[PDB]
Amino acid sequence: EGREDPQLLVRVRGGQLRGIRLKAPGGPVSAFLGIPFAEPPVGSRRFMPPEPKRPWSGVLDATTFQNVCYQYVDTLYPGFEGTEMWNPNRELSEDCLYLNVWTPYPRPASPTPVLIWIYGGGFYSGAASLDVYDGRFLAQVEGAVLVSMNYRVGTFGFLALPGSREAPGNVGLLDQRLALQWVQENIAAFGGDPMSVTLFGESAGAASVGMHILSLPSRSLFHRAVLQSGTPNGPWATVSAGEARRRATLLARLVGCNDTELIACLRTRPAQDLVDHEWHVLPQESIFRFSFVPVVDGDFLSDTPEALINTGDFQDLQVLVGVVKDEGSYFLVYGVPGFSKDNESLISRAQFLAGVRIGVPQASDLAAEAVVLHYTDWLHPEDPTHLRDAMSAVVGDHNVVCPVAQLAGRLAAQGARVYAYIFEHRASTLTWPLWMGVPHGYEIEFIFGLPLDPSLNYTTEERIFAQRLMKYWTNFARTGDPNDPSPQWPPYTTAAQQYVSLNLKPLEVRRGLRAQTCAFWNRFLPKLLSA
Ligand SMILES: *[C@@H]1O[C@H](CO)[C@@H](O)[C@H](O)[C@H]1NC(C)=O
Ligand SMILES: *[C@@H]1O[C@H](CO)[C@@H](O)[C@H](O)[C@H]1NC(C)=O
């Protein structure tokens, strides 16, 4: 301070910050990266609810991203951009509770609507610093204030001995909640409007947004929510207290460890030892299942998300939810034999039956038969191309498309204003093979407006498409309505079940989100599982 850029010095509750001026394609933006919002949850604080960060002295340098929360690093396809883009891009550390703010430059002179991003990655990975979550474009082009926070994942964020004091569960969700409290207190300092805060996230980040909707103390911290390909209901986003306890104690055993004693022993283990064993505690060979996720603790979650969306009053809530065209394909190449990014993955009937048992790992024999019966093409029951695509649909429908359907429906029936979409454009720059279609996670780079960066090699149409999506999302944040006061985007309702297609063509309205197949998963499967 003296010779420094006066536009980049800001004070928050904990002290003084110095940000950085970044170049976006249409002009500069302000970034404040690596702002601590919690005491490092290390040592005796592992597994504990986060504690608000204590004020610092001097000017904290906020010009670079901070550490990524310790996590498993995916190694299926080494050096291949398809997997690498999701991997940690800063040092892994338990000291990782930091958040990031982008704003116009100079800062808005009047209060601007805030978007808060929560990343996905199965509650076992992810980071707010990845290139695909870069807020410079939304800030520069839409004038948004954008916030994203790291939160603890894996065991560090989600290992629970329900009822204990030392490992109560859900602390990754409480990391997110603390960041939201930080926004309420401090965002006015950056030109943000704490009275207009829209949450958005994808996959597990979406489930997270969902859980904030369903958890009362989070409710006063935001006004609107966007759930991209993820929901708090469904088969992967939560586990019961019993199951959480069973996994935590199996994991303790695997690393050589009365809850207080078990937990103290876990606290002496190297971070990397926990990461090395976390995946071993799943009860069946699975895909789209994760070891350490939110637990129904009767605390953060007072009941299952199913019970809470069923009985909730959602009157003052606006919500944007949707899915990509091919939610399942991405997951098949990891753990279903016969699938691969490097060939067409034309599978046999035998491999379809086997993949159904992996895709629906909780299924009894009869339930699995029902799944196979429903997805088999009975004019061509052995055709490898249909079996390959049907396998994808099983996984995408069970895990994402049908839970989203159930969510939109319950939320509307109960007074929320809902807008639904299906995203159907495949990036021209996609490195996954064609058969995977428009895979899970590949809408994000358009919502954040990466196609605006000329060096990324997107097409001109893709550039205009990204601009449209950015408008929808920020209109929504701003007013609860994606429409600009072009074809209209009607609200989703139980009666008409309308949603739109997001692609290069103008909005097209459709009805029924896999209505027929989703009745199978949402109404019939549960009844069949008992017995
Ligand atoms: C594609 O590759 C996978 C793994 O290498 C293999 O199991 C599968 O059989 C291959 N597909 C065909 C039909 O060759
Ligand atoms: C974009 O295209 C140019 C020209 O071939 C190439 O040199 C550059 O590496 C490309 N960047 C990406 C990420 O595709």
Author numbering: 1 to 257, 265 to 492, 497 to 542
What does the report in the manuscript say about this coordinate set?
Acetylcholinesterase (AChE) terminates cholinergic transmission by rapidly hydrolyzing the neurotransmitter acetylcholine, and it is an essential enzyme for humans and other species. The catalytic triad in this enzyme consists of Ser203, His447 and Glu334 located at the bottom of a ∼20-Å-deep active-site gorge, where the residue numbers are based on the sequence numbering of mouse AChE (mAChE) that is used throughout this paper. One key step of current treatment of OP intoxication is to use oximes as nucleophiles to reactivate AChE by removing the phosphorous conjugate.
Knowing the aging half-life of sarin of ∼3 hours for hAChE and the half-life of ∼4.6 minutes for sarin in the presence of HI-6, we found that 30-minute exposure to 2 mM of sarin followed by one-minute exposure to HI-6 led to a good-quality electron density map that unequivocally defines a nonaged sarin and most of the HI-6 structure. The side chain of Trp286 undergoes a large conformational change relative to the apo mAChE. Modelling this density feature as a carbonate ion resulted in good correlation to the crystallographic data and this ligand was included in the final model. The electron density for the side chain of Asp74 is disordered and thus modelled in two conformations: one is similar to that found in the apo mAChE structure, and the other, which is dominant, point with its carboxyl oxygen toward the central linker of HI-6. The oxime-pyridinium ring of HI-6 enters the catalytic site and forms cation-pi interactions with side chains of Tyr124, Tyr337, Phe338, and Tyr341. The two carbon atoms of HI-6 that are near Tyr337 are not well defined by the electron density map; these atoms clash with the side chain of Tyr337 (3.1 Å) and have high B factors.
